[PDB]
């Protein structure tokens, strides 16, 4: 049967023209006589691919030459260790602003390798807000400030960014990467797994200011050492070649769409349809997140009639809208609406919500 | 070339055509699920069926006993060079190594960050052409484990039988001969390897580990390197390399269809013999430096007496659709990597090419 509307939160839906391009290239990429999956990573074909992927990503996000771009394995969770291993001594302090459970996971891992100060946590109001930056009390000698830019489970997204009092800003942008323009120069490090907006799982992108590379802790595994990866242009060991190729296809296609200003407009448009449906529902559907920080990528919502949640999810799936189930601890629903989710999928969901409400009025 | 070439790359490597064509067919919509494998939730029922079948197929192929875990991880074999001593040793423990090539040497260097190392024997002095007699190896009396690289991909040295560890257990990097032949898994505490030679694309690393060795990692172990975390979450602690795992699953299923590892080994031995016999019968025109009894079935390094002709040999072979034959910078010459999926006809073409080349340049 046909392709479904896939609301999965990661891995996620990918552009159909990209998938079909990959299908067409799979057996024999451009007359090279082999698949990307069979290429030497030190061969001229693969080198062309990873170089074009880097150049395309630099163009898309406007990443200047003062920053390195690394294509790594291990997921964002590997970076939770790599960051303080590379950037801190064991007795340095990192500040965290914790706006959901991904930030909390980052804090717990960093505690192995340095000191951590959680200068603000949204937990007491169920992770529904971003703090006022002026009232944060930042540690005066902090090495860096870590945020999770888009909290995938909780639907809380930074629109503006804090200015570190000392040191530099590090952001986990896994679930909103390449969804909108970002002024990279405000950051020391931007990182994220590919598997929401830019490719399949198995590739993690690290964007790191060059003056911060080097001097990792002695216990840093070679495979977590940024200087090693940078000096070898992400080919220290065998990279995730097919994944990097797929990212390259996605980056190329985002440029063809008109770049990130255009991508942002589409994302804002389709998210507004869903949030407006929720707010106009007279409480039938509810989104807990404070309006100004509502994610364009992950939309958590509940039903006033909580007992109807299983029926909602099951009937949506019969209507080809899958993976709408929300997190264990609040229940309800989560609509993930990443760059490649078609406008028509969001419209189908909004129509289904309207009909469901009228039926269970 | 709009025909597929004979691809002698050392990793990533050639893969079976039937596997690639199955992946092509299903890439847009896997089995009416309505999405690609590349778009599936790792916590969803479709992907769970894929990873579970991949593990089941591998357990059958290798005859992995029930008391071993199978982990599908990211990071390559190089990440395991760190994860092994982090998980298995305290910081003042010792690991013994037999070093038969440069991959083992890299494992030693990384392990030193995490524990003490002892190289009992190195083949470096004879340019990595031999395996030591095992009984005379002086093992450390309290060594936690003994590490080998079962197939040294650059040097072409392959273990046929295995040493018996004295105090601890045996760990083997089988990256470049993984699923080329039967292995008595019970002889090992850990077998590991990147998928990218014999069983899949780059991005997936397999670790087969005895369950009683899991747990008790050093406090500084990253969560992503911790065997207990991966095992208790069945390799889904974080987001796994879903598509790579899928691809490995296809390869395992095809290796079972071929008749399993006894059949795979026969084919490997047969095609390797063709190439080694061509070299030995050439009256010194071609030379392999490796001692005969430990010559790899997977990677065949060889040189020309007239070394000035090596560049032409490689360029001319590539015009004849035999690519990636250049050998390592320290010895020059050539390296023919002839993994499971390398067709017999590719080895036949190279041998015929070698014959013609010698006749022409004799
Ligand atoms: C915002 C965020 N951060 C980190 C992660 C962890 O990424 P990975 O599974 O690649 O380790 C996720 C995964 N959903 C995420 O959404
Ligand atoms: C025997 C062996 N061990 C380890 C490695 C390193 O593996 P990776 O690039 O996946 O880290 C290689 C790669 N050629 C290898 O051949
Ligand atoms: Na201090």
XYZ file of C-alpha atoms and ligand atoms in Angstrom:
756
model
C 0.000 0.000 0.000
C 1.010 3.702 -0.306
C 3.417 5.727 1.841
C 1.979 6.792 5.182
C 2.170 10.094 7.034
C 4.989 9.265 9.447
C 5.081 11.332 12.619
C 8.042 9.441 14.218
C 10.284 11.606 16.381
C 13.602 10.140 15.195
C 14.476 8.459 12.959
C 12.032 10.324 10.864
C 10.342 10.933 7.517
C 12.701 11.993 4.638
C 11.972 13.761 1.334
C 10.544 11.372 -1.251
C 12.660 12.796 -4.105
C 15.788 12.151 -1.957
C 14.731 8.575 -1.268
C 14.105 7.956 -4.982
C 17.475 9.500 -5.892
C 19.119 7.113 -3.427
C 17.211 4.192 -4.943
C 18.375 5.109 -8.419
C 22.034 5.478 -7.359
C 22.125 2.432 -5.015
C 23.474 -0.338 -7.239
C 25.916 1.810 -9.268
C 26.486 5.409 -8.248
C 26.973 7.615 -11.316
C 28.700 4.963 -13.458
C 31.440 4.476 -10.898
C 30.667 0.766 -11.082
C 29.747 0.346 -7.403
C 27.381 1.436 -4.662
C 28.221 4.240 -2.261
C 28.004 1.393 0.322
C 31.033 -0.278 -1.327
C 33.312 2.744 -1.920
C 36.669 3.239 -0.277
C 36.479 6.198 2.079
C 39.903 7.276 0.781
C 38.795 6.979 -2.881
C 38.070 9.886 -5.165
C 34.306 9.214 -5.428
C 33.690 9.235 -1.702
C 35.969 12.196 -1.217
C 33.820 14.137 -3.701
C 30.712 13.165 -1.778
C 31.862 14.177 1.713
C 33.440 17.367 0.378
C 30.218 18.397 -1.379
C 28.165 17.548 1.735
C 30.398 19.847 3.829
C 30.286 22.674 1.269
C 26.480 22.382 0.912
C 25.971 22.364 4.690
C 28.276 25.398 5.079
C 26.208 27.243 2.472
C 22.912 26.236 4.073
C 23.639 27.208 7.644
C 26.225 29.897 6.729
C 29.087 28.243 8.597
C 32.208 30.362 8.221
C 35.738 29.094 7.900
C 36.571 29.820 11.556
C 34.457 26.659 12.277
C 35.143 22.986 11.505
C 32.385 20.657 10.343
C 32.767 17.018 11.520
C 30.725 14.013 10.329
C 30.895 11.473 13.124
C 29.290 8.276 14.418
C 27.929 7.491 17.857
C 24.827 9.689 18.055
C 24.303 12.895 20.027
C 24.669 10.756 23.163
C 28.359 10.122 22.312
C 28.785 13.974 22.212
C 27.382 14.170 25.739
C 30.775 12.661 26.731
C 32.928 14.112 23.976
C 32.025 17.724 24.806
C 33.430 17.931 28.331
C 36.254 15.436 27.503
C 37.499 17.791 24.766
C 36.565 21.196 26.173
C 37.169 20.862 29.907
C 39.705 19.819 32.443
C 38.350 17.463 35.141
C 37.929 20.359 37.618
C 36.435 22.903 35.221
C 32.736 23.866 35.538
C 30.027 23.759 32.816
C 26.691 25.584 33.179
C 23.487 23.938 31.967
C 20.067 25.418 31.260
C 17.756 22.403 31.382
C 14.511 22.755 29.427
C 13.620 19.040 29.043
C 14.925 15.535 29.472
C 17.628 15.667 26.748
C 19.428 18.441 28.668
C 19.112 16.345 31.784
C 20.773 13.402 30.030
C 23.621 15.695 28.940
C 24.165 16.885 32.576
C 24.348 13.342 33.927
C 26.971 12.262 31.361
C 29.085 15.457 31.805
C 29.334 14.824 35.583
C 31.698 11.989 34.803
C 34.248 14.338 33.278
C 33.907 17.727 34.928
C 31.821 19.769 37.368
C 28.260 20.744 36.375
C 26.044 23.609 37.555
C 22.394 23.445 36.564
C 21.717 27.149 36.681
C 18.057 26.720 35.684
C 15.688 23.763 35.316
C 12.171 23.699 33.897
C 11.300 20.473 35.709
C 9.132 22.025 38.406
C 6.606 23.142 35.748
C 6.882 20.003 33.693
C 9.302 21.497 31.163
C 7.043 24.021 29.551
C 9.179 27.209 29.526
C 12.534 28.793 28.617
C 13.983 31.082 31.348
C 14.451 34.835 31.061
C 18.131 35.040 30.191
C 18.863 38.243 32.147
C 17.918 36.553 35.439
C 20.165 33.530 34.935
C 23.000 33.443 37.425
C 25.890 32.122 35.289
C 29.058 30.735 36.853
C 31.784 33.428 36.448
C 34.518 31.034 35.301
C 32.305 28.510 33.454
C 33.995 26.928 30.426
C 30.718 26.815 28.517
C 26.941 27.027 28.737
C 24.966 24.074 27.369
C 21.445 24.217 26.025
C 19.232 21.774 24.174
C 17.792 24.017 21.468
C 14.735 21.894 20.789
C 13.613 19.528 23.525
C 12.186 16.708 21.428
C 9.925 15.075 24.077
C 8.671 18.277 25.717
C 8.161 20.551 22.679
C 10.184 23.509 24.055
C 12.330 25.390 21.530
C 14.686 28.374 21.941
C 13.866 31.144 19.527
C 16.555 33.564 20.826
C 19.794 32.427 22.516
C 21.494 33.331 25.786
C 24.851 35.094 25.858
C 27.374 33.270 28.038
C 28.826 35.492 30.763
C 32.156 33.680 30.327
C 33.154 31.018 27.780
C 30.982 29.961 24.858
C 27.571 28.522 23.995
C 27.021 24.821 23.161
C 23.741 23.716 21.682
C 22.209 20.292 21.018
C 20.229 21.022 17.854
C 19.420 17.360 17.049
C 15.707 17.843 16.547
C 15.700 21.291 14.831
C 18.929 21.144 12.852
C 18.621 22.895 9.467
C 14.988 23.899 10.178
C 15.848 27.641 10.174
C 18.768 30.074 9.939
C 21.161 30.112 12.905
C 23.917 32.689 13.444
C 26.717 30.161 14.010
C 29.076 32.889 15.269
C 27.067 33.061 18.508
C 28.108 29.483 19.333
C 31.262 27.611 20.264
C 29.659 24.260 19.301
C 26.469 23.169 17.573
C 25.828 19.413 17.424
C 23.067 16.992 16.471
C 22.245 13.508 15.242
C 21.191 13.541 11.574
C 18.094 11.401 12.078
C 15.360 14.100 12.457
C 15.910 16.625 9.735
C 18.915 15.776 7.728
C 19.377 12.051 7.137
C 19.154 8.541 8.548
C 20.485 7.476 11.911
C 24.201 6.701 12.153
C 25.659 10.204 11.484
C 26.145 12.994 13.997
C 27.233 16.473 12.908
C 29.557 18.582 15.054
C 30.177 22.265 14.167
C 33.027 23.539 16.348
C 34.934 26.807 16.440
C 38.515 25.995 15.447
C 40.133 27.777 18.375
C 38.351 25.320 20.746
C 39.795 22.195 19.141
C 42.650 20.357 20.855
C 43.836 19.766 24.403
C 41.309 16.942 25.227
C 41.595 15.120 28.543
C 44.128 12.247 28.453
C 41.352 9.639 28.958
C 39.523 10.816 25.819
C 39.057 7.859 23.420
C 40.743 8.613 20.045
C 37.296 8.252 18.501
C 35.920 11.066 20.674
C 38.853 13.473 20.098
C 37.892 16.489 18.020
C 41.492 17.346 16.997
C 41.925 13.872 15.528
C 38.690 14.119 13.577
C 39.412 17.671 12.366
C 42.987 17.041 11.282
C 41.829 13.953 9.371
C 38.711 15.678 7.876
C 36.393 13.064 9.456
C 38.354 10.165 7.834
C 40.505 9.145 10.829
C 38.771 5.760 10.791
C 36.088 4.421 8.492
C 33.240 6.966 8.426
C 29.529 6.237 7.978
C 29.829 6.695 4.216
C 26.272 5.923 3.097
C 24.833 8.063 5.888
C 27.068 11.026 4.939
C 25.978 10.557 1.312
C 22.328 10.639 2.385
C 22.908 13.826 4.463
C 24.537 15.306 1.326
C 21.377 14.506 -0.688
C 19.205 16.193 1.976
C 21.472 19.306 2.122
C 21.437 19.620 -1.667
C 17.620 19.436 -1.689
C 17.251 22.030 1.098
C 19.362 24.410 -1.027
C 17.120 23.600 -4.033
C 14.054 24.538 -1.879
C 15.528 28.082 -1.522
C 17.563 27.595 1.637
C 16.756 27.910 5.304
C 14.734 31.081 5.203
C 12.257 29.236 2.906
C 12.396 26.029 4.981
C 11.584 28.076 8.105
C 8.518 29.640 6.427
C 7.113 26.214 5.550
C 7.833 24.899 9.026
C 6.120 27.903 10.648
C 3.110 27.552 8.347
C 2.421 23.879 9.053
C 3.117 24.140 12.789
C 0.671 27.093 13.013
C -2.097 24.942 11.498
C -1.699 22.382 14.283
C -1.220 24.784 17.191
C -4.191 26.838 15.985
C -6.328 23.685 15.843
C -5.334 22.878 19.402
C -6.028 26.409 20.754
C -9.341 26.678 18.907
C -10.510 23.316 20.339
C -12.054 24.860 23.430
C -9.859 22.670 25.648
C -10.641 19.391 23.936
C -6.967 19.239 22.925
C -4.301 20.857 25.139
C -0.649 21.854 24.606
C 1.151 22.549 27.941
C 4.111 24.512 26.493
C 4.288 28.289 26.896
C 3.239 29.923 23.601
C 6.407 31.870 22.814
C 8.644 28.746 22.960
C 6.434 26.187 21.248
C 8.556 23.970 19.004
C 7.983 24.024 15.252
C 9.285 20.418 15.160
C 7.682 18.476 18.081
C 4.107 19.170 19.174
C 2.999 17.445 22.378
C -0.672 17.515 23.225
C -3.217 15.773 25.407
C -6.965 15.251 25.453
C -9.185 16.632 28.220
C -10.840 13.200 27.972
C -7.690 11.246 28.591
C -9.432 7.863 28.211
C -9.918 8.673 24.502
C -6.158 8.902 23.788
C -5.752 5.245 22.738
C -8.717 5.472 20.345
C -7.314 8.719 18.875
C -3.934 7.114 18.165
C -5.398 3.874 16.824
C -7.891 5.568 14.492
C -5.304 8.089 13.258
C -3.102 5.126 12.281
C -5.987 3.529 10.352
C -6.149 6.816 8.463
C -2.344 6.480 7.628
C -1.040 8.822 10.334
C 1.380 6.750 12.436
C 3.668 7.247 15.480
C 1.528 9.909 17.169
C 1.775 8.324 20.660
C 3.212 10.691 23.339
C 5.639 10.056 26.179
C 4.945 7.625 28.996
C 4.847 10.336 31.701
C 2.144 12.710 30.374
C 0.713 10.203 27.997
C -1.170 11.840 25.184
C 0.183 12.490 21.702
C 3.259 13.934 20.054
C 3.143 15.081 16.458
C 6.688 15.346 15.134
C 6.574 17.615 12.030
C 10.131 17.833 10.755
C 11.248 19.507 7.512
C 10.229 16.554 5.297
C 6.672 16.034 6.764
C 4.379 17.080 3.914
C 2.018 19.986 4.434
C -0.769 17.572 3.445
C 0.106 15.309 6.434
C -0.384 18.143 8.883
C -3.631 19.088 7.110
C -4.839 15.494 7.315
C -4.087 15.423 11.030
C -5.901 18.764 11.654
C -8.960 17.501 9.747
C -8.886 14.238 11.718
C -8.732 16.209 14.998
C -11.707 18.349 13.954
C -13.748 15.212 13.123
C -12.656 13.407 16.295
C -13.653 16.338 18.440
C -17.094 16.594 16.819
C -17.644 12.857 17.278
C -16.589 12.873 20.972
C -18.141 16.265 21.777
C 31.472 2.135 -16.448
C 27.786 1.330 -16.441
C 28.632 -2.294 -15.716
C 29.729 -3.027 -12.156
C 33.482 -3.310 -11.722
C 35.561 -5.839 -9.748
C 36.123 -3.916 -6.535
C 39.172 -4.998 -4.539
C 38.755 -2.250 -1.900
C 39.944 -3.244 1.591
C 37.012 -1.724 3.518
C 34.414 -0.551 2.870
C 34.198 -3.391 0.378
C 32.234 -5.080 -2.330
C 28.803 -6.442 -1.300
C 26.548 -9.115 -2.807
C 24.570 -7.950 -5.832
C 21.412 -9.728 -4.707
C 21.608 -7.880 -1.392
C 22.061 -4.495 -3.113
C 19.131 -5.198 -5.459
C 16.871 -6.240 -2.539
C 17.767 -2.962 -0.790
C 17.032 -1.030 -3.987
C 13.662 -2.707 -4.427
C 12.503 -1.999 -0.887
C 14.105 1.424 -0.294
C 11.021 3.616 -0.778
C 8.499 1.448 1.037
C 9.666 -1.631 2.971
C 7.106 -4.477 2.753
C 3.977 -2.225 2.662
C 4.940 -0.666 5.994
C 4.563 2.656 4.204
C 8.098 3.938 4.726
C 11.777 3.287 4.117
C 13.952 1.424 6.623
C 15.777 4.828 6.785
C 12.600 6.432 8.213
C 11.530 3.756 10.737
C 11.321 4.290 14.511
C 13.940 2.166 16.179
C 11.316 1.404 18.835
C 8.698 0.355 16.264
C 7.631 -3.150 15.380
C 9.098 -3.164 11.857
C 12.592 -2.262 12.971
C 12.404 -4.579 15.985
C 11.653 -7.446 13.554
C 14.689 -6.473 11.448
C 17.221 -6.204 14.281
C 15.924 -9.377 15.933
C 16.162 -11.357 12.695
C 19.645 -10.019 12.052
C 20.764 -11.216 15.487
C 19.015 -14.591 15.057
C 20.597 -15.127 11.595
C 24.033 -14.259 12.905
C 23.683 -16.619 15.894
C 22.860 -19.422 13.426
C 25.675 -18.582 11.012
C 28.400 -18.493 13.629
C 26.800 -21.009 16.003
C 26.919 -18.463 18.836
C 26.050 -20.032 22.154
C 23.194 -18.727 24.271
C 25.566 -17.500 27.001
C 26.934 -14.814 24.609
C 25.398 -11.399 23.838
C 25.391 -9.869 20.361
C 25.578 -6.064 20.213
C 25.138 -3.887 17.107
C 27.020 -0.612 17.799
C 28.363 2.493 16.064
C 31.883 3.884 16.258
C 33.848 1.270 14.302
C 36.380 -1.203 15.595
C 38.484 1.822 16.703
C 35.879 2.731 19.361
C 36.231 -0.867 20.684
C 39.963 -0.341 21.123
C 38.844 1.989 23.965
C 35.644 0.177 25.062
C 37.399 -3.178 25.621
C 39.799 -2.140 28.429
C 37.225 0.389 29.794
C 34.699 -2.391 30.281
C 36.926 -5.348 31.080
C 39.783 -3.905 33.144
C 40.526 -1.772 36.117
C 43.132 0.933 35.548
C 45.954 -1.194 37.092
C 45.098 -4.404 35.287
C 47.269 -5.777 32.447
C 46.229 -6.821 28.948
C 48.493 -9.119 26.928
C 48.782 -8.615 23.144
C 50.162 -10.646 20.255
C 50.910 -8.075 17.562
C 50.912 -9.449 14.024
C 50.245 -6.200 12.123
C 49.437 -2.530 12.514
C 45.832 -3.007 13.563
C 46.973 -4.799 16.720
C 49.548 -2.113 17.292
C 46.775 0.513 17.229
C 44.761 -1.483 19.785
C 47.761 -1.521 22.134
C 48.304 2.267 21.938
C 44.646 3.050 22.705
C 44.455 0.476 25.562
C 47.366 2.209 27.343
C 45.059 5.131 28.188
C 42.903 2.770 30.289
C 45.150 0.004 31.747
C 48.601 -1.556 31.439
C 49.603 -3.340 28.254
C 52.119 -6.044 27.488
C 53.144 -7.000 23.959
C 54.361 -10.553 24.390
C 55.391 -10.877 20.770
C 55.593 -8.474 17.812
C 56.071 -9.439 14.157
C 57.358 -5.963 13.287
C 61.033 -6.979 13.036
C 60.275 -9.207 10.025
C 57.779 -6.758 8.507
C 54.721 -8.611 9.869
C 54.922 -11.860 7.915
C 54.428 -14.490 10.626
C 52.368 -15.719 13.571
C 54.328 -16.964 16.633
C 54.289 -20.531 17.897
C 51.769 -20.290 20.790
C 53.109 -22.610 23.447
C 56.327 -20.544 23.874
C 54.437 -17.241 24.376
C 55.179 -15.936 27.879
C 51.797 -14.696 29.137
C 51.405 -12.339 32.098
C 50.277 -14.418 35.084
C 47.524 -12.016 36.098
C 46.596 -10.636 32.625
C 42.840 -9.997 32.330
C 42.831 -11.019 28.674
C 44.931 -11.774 25.621
C 44.219 -9.704 22.473
C 44.831 -10.743 18.853
C 43.899 -9.308 15.473
C 42.740 -12.449 13.715
C 43.219 -11.008 10.221
C 45.719 -8.168 9.803
C 44.177 -6.384 6.838
C 47.264 -4.479 5.622
C 49.831 -7.248 6.180
C 47.870 -10.275 5.070
C 48.564 -12.386 8.158
C 45.686 -14.552 9.347
C 45.289 -16.768 12.408
C 44.193 -20.301 11.437
C 44.306 -21.773 14.972
C 44.118 -19.669 18.165
C 46.280 -19.321 21.295
C 44.877 -20.481 24.666
C 44.903 -17.648 27.158
C 46.599 -18.589 30.441
C 44.972 -16.469 33.172
C 42.091 -14.783 31.355
C 40.095 -14.932 28.140
C 40.773 -14.347 24.459
C 39.663 -11.256 22.569
C 39.897 -11.085 18.787
C 39.467 -8.276 16.271
C 37.887 -10.152 13.367
C 36.926 -7.049 11.375
C 38.422 -8.219 8.083
C 37.605 -11.981 8.271
C 34.268 -11.802 10.115
C 31.854 -14.573 8.859
C 34.396 -15.875 6.349
C 34.522 -19.262 8.085
C 33.338 -21.162 11.132
C 34.672 -19.956 14.505
C 34.348 -21.841 17.809
C 32.958 -18.842 19.670
C 33.242 -20.574 23.081
C 37.072 -20.212 22.811
C 36.639 -16.390 23.089
C 35.480 -13.913 25.666
C 34.960 -11.279 22.946
C 34.918 -11.231 19.195
C 34.414 -7.809 17.506
C 34.629 -6.254 14.092
C 33.391 -3.460 11.824
C 30.815 -4.700 9.314
C 32.389 -2.989 6.366
C 34.504 -5.910 4.973
C 32.375 -8.950 4.977
C 28.945 -8.284 6.375
C 27.659 -4.790 5.515
C 28.365 -1.120 5.011
C 30.412 1.093 7.275
C 28.613 2.434 10.315
C 27.927 -0.776 12.192
C 30.305 -2.669 14.516
C 29.420 -6.079 15.942
C 30.496 -7.215 19.427
C 29.977 -10.816 20.542
C 30.650 -10.978 24.253
C 30.328 -13.674 26.921
C 27.535 -12.533 29.262
C 29.557 -13.141 32.441
C 32.063 -10.467 31.267
C 29.409 -7.766 31.009
C 29.080 -5.080 33.743
C 31.567 -3.353 36.012
C 33.013 -0.862 33.460
C 35.398 1.823 34.769
C 33.600 4.927 36.141
C 34.980 7.103 33.325
C 33.415 4.905 30.566
C 31.119 6.949 28.352
C 27.572 5.614 28.459
C 27.887 4.900 24.727
C 30.870 2.646 25.278
C 29.324 0.690 28.206
C 28.553 -2.954 27.335
C 26.029 -3.396 30.130
C 23.976 -0.411 28.898
C 23.931 -1.765 25.310
C 23.126 -5.330 26.442
C 20.315 -4.526 28.853
C 18.771 -2.255 26.118
C 19.314 -4.790 23.339
C 21.380 -2.279 21.320
C 18.600 0.310 21.441
C 19.840 2.489 24.306
C 20.155 5.400 21.910
C 19.299 5.565 18.206
C 21.073 2.670 16.472
C 22.443 2.674 12.861
C 19.123 1.254 11.627
C 19.844 1.088 7.925
C 23.310 -0.413 8.441
C 21.774 -3.063 10.714
C 19.180 -3.806 8.046
C 21.906 -4.215 5.466
C 23.918 -6.551 7.730
C 20.661 -8.542 8.185
C 20.373 -8.972 4.420
C 23.977 -10.209 4.196
C 23.534 -12.703 7.005
C 20.325 -14.049 5.406
C 22.202 -14.489 2.072
C 25.161 -16.213 3.743
C 22.703 -18.713 5.230
C 21.145 -19.224 1.747
C 24.656 -19.969 0.401
C 24.838 -22.950 2.797
C 26.451 -21.308 5.818
C 30.022 -20.709 6.815
C 31.418 -24.102 5.847
C 30.426 -23.340 2.248
C 31.580 -19.738 2.450
C 35.024 -20.922 3.660
C 35.396 -23.404 0.787
C 34.728 -20.678 -1.736
C 37.104 -18.326 -0.006
C 39.893 -20.885 0.091
C 39.365 -21.760 -3.559
C 39.595 -18.213 -4.901
C 42.521 -17.281 -2.609
C 44.439 -20.372 -3.842
C 44.083 -19.189 -7.431
C 45.820 -15.925 -6.639
C 48.511 -17.347 -4.330
C 49.359 -20.091 -6.873
C 49.679 -17.472 -9.645
C 52.141 -15.547 -7.444
C 54.168 -18.631 -6.440
C 54.288 -20.006 -10.008
C 55.591 -16.692 -11.451
C 59.284 -17.428 -10.820
C 59.658 -14.310 -8.675
C 57.936 -11.804 -10.992
C 55.243 -11.419 -8.318
C 56.116 -11.896 -4.611
C 54.046 -12.384 -1.435
C 56.135 -11.824 1.776
C 53.797 -13.661 4.179
C 54.734 -17.069 5.573
C 52.684 -19.739 3.750
C 50.702 -21.273 6.653
C 49.285 -17.868 7.784
C 48.435 -16.317 4.417
C 45.108 -14.489 4.634
C 42.141 -15.709 2.565
C 40.870 -12.061 2.670
C 43.767 -9.689 1.932
C 46.593 -10.613 -0.419
C 49.580 -8.256 -0.442
C 52.076 -8.681 -3.290
C 54.884 -6.809 -5.034
C 56.775 -6.966 -8.342
C 60.491 -7.658 -8.621
C 60.367 -4.803 -11.148
C 58.749 -2.395 -8.712
C 58.971 0.429 -11.313
C 56.118 -1.347 -13.098
C 53.691 -1.352 -10.130
C 52.032 1.927 -11.019
C 51.382 0.710 -14.578
C 50.084 -2.646 -13.313
C 47.542 -0.843 -11.100
C 46.469 1.676 -13.762
C 46.159 -0.980 -16.477
C 44.150 -3.282 -14.109
C 41.753 -0.386 -13.391
C 41.186 0.156 -17.140
C 40.248 -3.557 -17.202
C 37.700 -2.868 -14.397
C 39.795 -4.258 -11.490
C 39.981 -1.329 -9.092
C 41.551 -0.421 -5.749
C 44.551 -2.778 -6.044
C 47.207 -0.327 -4.741
C 49.101 -1.631 -1.677
C 50.236 0.241 1.459
C 52.764 3.046 1.272
C 55.428 1.247 3.408
C 55.918 -1.716 0.934
C 54.309 -0.463 -2.281
C 53.051 -3.163 -4.563
C 49.499 -4.242 -4.538
C 46.855 -5.608 -2.175
C 44.013 -7.661 -3.561
C 41.201 -7.735 -1.041
C 39.053 -10.718 -1.840
C 36.279 -10.777 0.705
C 33.221 -13.064 0.745
C 31.342 -11.075 -1.925
C 34.217 -10.751 -4.419
C 33.075 -12.908 -7.322
C 35.218 -15.855 -8.354
C 35.312 -14.305 -11.852
C 37.036 -11.171 -10.497
C 39.857 -13.255 -9.045
C 40.002 -15.194 -12.331
C 40.279 -11.944 -14.270
C 43.085 -10.646 -12.058
C 45.053 -13.919 -12.392
C 44.632 -13.813 -16.208
C 45.712 -10.171 -16.167
C 48.771 -11.025 -14.118
C 49.724 -13.708 -16.622
C 49.476 -11.403 -19.596
C 51.351 -8.635 -17.730
C 54.250 -10.901 -16.845
C 54.461 -12.277 -20.431
C 54.566 -8.721 -21.720
C 57.157 -7.397 -19.227
C 59.302 -10.503 -18.680
C 17.323 16.673 21.260
C 17.992 15.298 21.307
N 19.202 15.163 21.851
C 19.867 13.986 21.887
C 19.266 12.847 21.361
C 20.040 11.540 21.435
O 20.492 11.250 20.136
P 21.127 9.796 19.736
O 20.010 8.779 19.920
O 21.694 9.955 18.351
O 22.264 9.434 20.710
C 18.013 12.928 20.816
C 17.381 11.648 20.230
N 15.950 11.777 20.069
C 17.387 14.148 20.778
O 16.129 14.304 20.237
C 41.482 -5.546 11.213
C 40.977 -4.104 11.423
N 40.806 -3.644 12.677
C 40.357 -2.402 12.929
C 40.048 -1.538 11.875
C 39.514 -0.151 12.212
O 38.109 -0.195 11.985
P 37.185 1.138 11.857
O 37.680 1.978 10.711
O 35.758 0.673 11.761
O 37.375 1.882 13.190
C 40.208 -1.972 10.586
C 39.825 -1.039 9.426
N 40.472 -1.412 8.185
C 40.654 -3.257 10.360
O 40.829 -3.733 9.067
Na 37.300 27.562 41.317
